[PDB]
Amino acid sequence: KVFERCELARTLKRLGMDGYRGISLANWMCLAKWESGYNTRATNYNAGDRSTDYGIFQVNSRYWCNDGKTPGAVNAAHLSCSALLQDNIADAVAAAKRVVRDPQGIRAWVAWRNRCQNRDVRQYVQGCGV
């Protein structure tokens, strides 16, 4: 599923993401936009280390979900990476919350540092009613 901007905003708010571990909704939106373009089936194989990023938030199979084919992997969130490819993003949200519980926080995603950090991100939730 490819979410519409405001549709996603309201959905993340309902799932309790606004201000989770100090992370504003606008920031989560900026992250999803650049990671997958709000697409739940987005997958990206990292040939260099043999891991794959899954879903709307591009969660890595080496630490957060299990796909069985990732060398030296762990399952921190304890999910099947398959769960992060559903149209229903409840599991992707639970995984994303787990990622930011580590000290790195939102910085865990390099794309956030490149395109969201220290920028004006109000634009991602403008006019959505959240």
Using DSSP, state whether 49 is helix, strand or coil. coil
**Measuring CA to CA, which residue among 112, 96, 87 is closest to residue 20?**
96
**Measuring CA to CA, which residue among 100, 96, 17 is closest to residue 53?**
96
State the catalytic residue, choosing from 4, 53, 67, 120.
Answer: 53
Resolution of this entry, Å: 1.8
The answer for residues whose C-beta is within 8 angstroms of residue 118's C-beta and 6 or more apart is: none
- Is residue 95 within 8 Å of 84, Cβ to Cβ? yes
**Measuring CA to CA, which residue among 55, 46, 59 is closest to residue 97?**
59
Chain centre distance of CA 82: 14
State the catalytic residue, choosing from 18, 35, 67, 91.
Answer: 35
List, in order of start, the domains of the chain with CATH numbers.
1-130 (1.10.530.10)
**CA–CA distance, 104 with 95 (Å, rounded to integer):** 15
Q: What was the structure determination method?
A: X-ray
* 91 given a catalytic annotation: no
* β-pair partners for 44: 53
CA-derived radius of gyration, the chain? 14
